[PDB]
Paper text:
The Ton complex is composed of three proteins ExbB, ExbD and TonB located in the inner membrane. It utilizes PMF to take up diverse compounds such as iron-loaded siderophores, haem, and vitamin B12 through outer membrane receptors. ExbB has three TM helices with a large cytoplasmic domain, and both ExbD and TonB are predicted to have single TM helices and a compact periplasmic domain. ExbB and ExbD together form a proton channel, and isolated ExbBD complexes show ion conductivity and cation selectivity in vitro.
The structure of crystals grown at pH 9.0 was solved to 2.8 Å by molecular replacement. A starting hexamer model was constructed by docking the coordinates of the ExbB monomer cut out from the pentamer into a low-resolution cryo-EM map of the hexameric complex. The asymmetric unit in the lattice with space group P21 (Supplementary file 1-Table S1) contains two ExbB hexamers, one disposed upside down with respect to the other, and interacting laterally with each other. The overall hexamer structure resembles a bell with a vertical dimension of ~110 Å and a maximal horizontal dimension on the cytoplasmic side of ~85 Å. A Fourier difference map revealed untraceable masses, probably parts of ExbD TM helices, inside the channel of the hexamer. Low occupancy and possibly flexibility may account for the lack of clarity. The ExbB monomers in the hexamer show similar structures to those in the pentamer (the average RMSD of Cα atoms between two monomers is 1.4 Å), despite the different subunit number. The channel in the hexamer is significantly larger than that in the pentamer. The diameter in the hexamer is ~17 Å and that in the pentamer ~10 Å through the TM region. Neighboring monomers of ExbB in the hexamer and in the pentamer bury approximately the same surface areas (3000 Å2) and the residues contributing to interactions are also similar. It is not obvious why hexamers crystallized at pH 9.0, but the negatively charged amino acids in the acidic cluster at the cytoplasmic end are further apart in the hexamer, and the channel radius is particularly large here. In the crystal, each ExbB subunit is settled on a flat plane parallel to the membrane and well follows the six-fold symmetry normal to this plane.
Numbering used by the authors:
A (entry chain C): 10 to 232
B (entry chain D): 19 to 233
C (entry chain E): 11 to 232
D (entry chain F): 19 to 234
E (entry chain A): 10 to 234
F (entry chain B): 20 to 234
Amino acid sequence: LSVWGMYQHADIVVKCVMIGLILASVVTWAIFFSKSVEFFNQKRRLKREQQLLAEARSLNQANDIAADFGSKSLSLHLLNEAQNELELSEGSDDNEGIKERTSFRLERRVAAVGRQMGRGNGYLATIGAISPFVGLFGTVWGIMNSFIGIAQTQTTNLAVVAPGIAEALLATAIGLVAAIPAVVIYNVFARQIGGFKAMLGDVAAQVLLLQSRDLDLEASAAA
Amino acid sequence: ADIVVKCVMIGLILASVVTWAIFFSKSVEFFNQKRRLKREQQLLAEARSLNQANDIAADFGSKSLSLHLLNEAQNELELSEGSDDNEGIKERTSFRLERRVAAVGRQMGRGNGYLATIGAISPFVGLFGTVWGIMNSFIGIAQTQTTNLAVVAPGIAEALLATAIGLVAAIPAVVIYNVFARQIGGFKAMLGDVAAQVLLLQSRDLDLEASAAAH
Amino acid sequence: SVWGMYQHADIVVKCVMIGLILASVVTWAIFFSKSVEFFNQKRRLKREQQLLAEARSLNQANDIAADFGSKSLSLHLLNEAQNELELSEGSDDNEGIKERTSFRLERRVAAVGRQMGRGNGYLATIGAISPFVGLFGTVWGIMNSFIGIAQTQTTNLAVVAPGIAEALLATAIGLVAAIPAVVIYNVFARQIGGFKAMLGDVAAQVLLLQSRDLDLEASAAA
Amino acid sequence: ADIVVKCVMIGLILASVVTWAIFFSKSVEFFNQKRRLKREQQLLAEARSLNQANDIAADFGSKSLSLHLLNEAQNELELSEGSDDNEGIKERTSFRLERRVAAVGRQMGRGNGYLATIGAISPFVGLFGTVWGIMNSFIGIAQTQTTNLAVVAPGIAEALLATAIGLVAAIPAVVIYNVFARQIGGFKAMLGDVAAQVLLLQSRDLDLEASAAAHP
Amino acid sequence: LSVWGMYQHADIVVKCVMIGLILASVVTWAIFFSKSVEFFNQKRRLKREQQLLAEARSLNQANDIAADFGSKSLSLHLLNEAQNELELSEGSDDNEGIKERTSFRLERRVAAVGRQMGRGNGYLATIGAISPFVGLFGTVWGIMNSFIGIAQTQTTNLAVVAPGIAEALLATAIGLVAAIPAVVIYNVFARQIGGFKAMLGDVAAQVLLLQSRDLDLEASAAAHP
Amino acid sequence: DIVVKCVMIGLILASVVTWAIFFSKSVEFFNQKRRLKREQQLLAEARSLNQANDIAADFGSKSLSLHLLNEAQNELELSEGSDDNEGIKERTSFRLERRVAAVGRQMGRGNGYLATIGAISPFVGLFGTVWGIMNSFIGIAQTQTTNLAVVAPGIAEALLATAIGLVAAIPAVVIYNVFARQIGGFKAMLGDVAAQVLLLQSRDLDLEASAAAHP
């Protein structure tokens, strides 16, 4: 017997748990292949940018390195945040206020990127968490049909009870196929987002160190 | 057939009706308030001063959240008119904005409590119906001195149906609760970023004003 | 009937049943008394918060709150701020007054939250142990089905039925006692948290008025 | 009879005796300490200065917790006699009082470790006796080649009794552990509020003293 | 009938589950007896040291009390940390920097001691975590052999399935004997390490209070006669 | 069965991945651990940051203690000409703590696979069992058998898939826990070395500032 052969011999209820769980599995692997390529390219880009910006000895030197990073560059967004804060604060005597406002902006920015990074993880979490609930529904539906079988035939043996038990076991099998990959993929991506946020945080830390040092050397020259 | 099992089933159907009713009313409330705030955040991002932010937000509407946060900062500056302590103004403004963002989040969640309880207890009220059903089938066996399972099979199948309905009421309530909980958290974070911009504009304005007075 | 079931059951299952029904009576008694208590308190604080939102100084806030009642929570927080200013009369450190007032108000709001919680401890224990006393009844019930087999020397559906029906009854009563207690405990825990947040917002307003007043007074001297 | 199973039931009965023994001793000490601290907190709430608080707390016992906290603040002021840094006195006092409140909370917890273990393992030692009992009934069936369940029903019923006793030992230990854990938490909060009052009085007194010296 | 008698009648697979779980239980109780005595002696020493150092009115007085505490005394290590900080900082005008550097050193030291106390708990955690899996494996294997029994012997009755069921139950019983004590002992030690860290933290707090007060009184004597 | 055969192959390939991480992390910890204890011991008798750089001169280019000292020296070099000593101390501690965190992250590489293999291997085993027993019941339905003996070899074979699943999971769980403990202990030691680099720099700056105030 084939999986399409099993589908045909199952009742309308278990046919729907099958359709719904296979569609849940198709969406799990579709999210997986699109997000895996998205993270790979983005980590490769940020790792190169982090290495190049590590050579900067001033915020101005960092802006020169990042000049040809691209409009959609994350390191260039963080540097533009620090430059916009110095431009708007042009004419202020409080250097500590510039540093505090820049760190506030960069940390909120890094958080916002982390939120964008997981637009599909919500689907992976729900699929992994509810797939066993629907498998259990098919399990109870399955055994209920075994008892309907006993009532209808007024007989209690393996053969009368087998169609309902096989149907119950099918719902558990499909439930495990949908749930296990969604749980694994959700956790791998949640770990990758956390590791990416930490790397982007190290780049924003460098933008902050360069700005803080530059302001201190300027304040020393005024004193 | 059983009055207790009948009550479990009508209770679960009512739980499902309430789940979808909460879903349709809250979905329209979120979609509108989440889209409006994203537009307001984009427009206010262009502001170079708190006065410029008030000009952008002039035509935002009376029920605008961004306009409430800007009015909080303006009320603080008006009441503090005549104070030498600029940090005292900044601290009082951040305290006010923090507390309002929190208060809005508390209001955004109203209706999520019902979804959580429906999703969590529905399988157990379902289980109660089947335990009760099978209990009565076994009271029946004792009373009649029955030996044949075929005589109790209709009662057992009917009892197991209560667990199936329980799981059908629970699954949508769990999914809908999690979608909304994620949306509320993401909205609180966005409203948090708008309040942060109101604070940055006020803090920078006070510093530039103090620098102009010193020289 | 439920009384008919009670009569046919063991002395052990009869005790588990009466203990769980009494646990359910206490759950709903706590529920009706605390629901009215929280509603009236939330209703009173929302009105007080709206009226005190109009205050432009701590003195104005004291005038608005004058007729709030002896048992008013907003009036207690305003009296905390006033007692701090009175005891600190003659101090040059305004920041010390602000710090001591915020320390007092936050500890006060915490203490009120603890006072709201009285009764929830019973709801938590009922909701948490009811499934375990239900499990005991199940184990006891199945044990009696095996005693039945030993006594009659026969394995049969009829022989084990009294033990199985008893076992199922203990699980049913356990679920009736546990489910409401768990729900009601969580509703109240959320309501206490929401009320503490509300009382915190009123304590925040008392602090803003005192902080602003001290700053404007210091500016007038300079 | 079964030795391993009889050992599990005597072990569970002894576990029940120790949960009620811990319960009666602890209930007596806790009630006595909570009752005393509530009275002390009410009396010390009237104090307008640290000196006034020491006068109110004179009529308190040697084993009084409120008097220990007040003695901590006074020992800090005595040892710091001759220091210009008032902020250093305040910081050292708050450090001492918070560590003291934490240490008292830890002392209150003595015995609760036993109420946690009994309530957590009792269902599992119960389960072990059941598994062991049923295992031996099946060893018996294998060795004698029986097919009648009636022959092993007394052994199976005896084995399931070990899970029932397990649950009877666990339920009171779990409840009593949670009531005491809640009481310790509520007591720590109250002792914290008394230490907070000792700190407010000392902080205010130092500030008013510094203000009186600035304006002679 | 006896535990060795059951071992002999069981499968080579059930024999392996049994020996692996019994060895896991031997190591659980061996760790338990060695750590319980080394923990008792250390807490007894620190409680005496805490009582004696509570009498100190200056950091110099604390060093005199702790002079004869012993080479591996924990209270003496904390006092040596404070003294080494004052010696290395000799010639510094920033007293706040001395206080900050000393608290940094003492908190890192208290953390390092807590990590040393934790030696062996890693084994208790792994035994608690893997024992239910190896017990489950024996149960699955046992029930599998009951089905092999139904297939091999033409018949399906209590006697045919009894050897497989008895084996399955044995694996669950041993699994519970290995797992439950390892989980309990791991949690008792984790609570005891936490309580010890808190007591050692109270001793380090006293070292810090004495140093902070001493520096403040010294600075006050330099400012005003 | 082809489905049950695939879970065995999957479970074998899962054991291959377990041996891979077992071998990479074995070599990375034997070679990087004990070296740190030696470096920390030598750095402990330092007195000055300059003295620490002399001790660490012959530590090796790939030394972690030498990387932390180079971080403190690069901060002093880039900050040459700054009056704010507190800003140098703050920037150095920020750099070192982010560096220690980054090393901890690099050390965890592979443990994610050990955790998932150990946690998920019993479930792919369970799937094979459920699938096997399902086909035995399809067989009973198709033939109308009433004898458990004809369907016992298939059930015993299906239960074998859970046994193999547990045999694959147990080594991954053990190895994951040993490595998790080793990483944590190493992070703690590297943290203590970075703490020493910070204490030396902080003390040096304070003694330098005191020498300038009263020459």
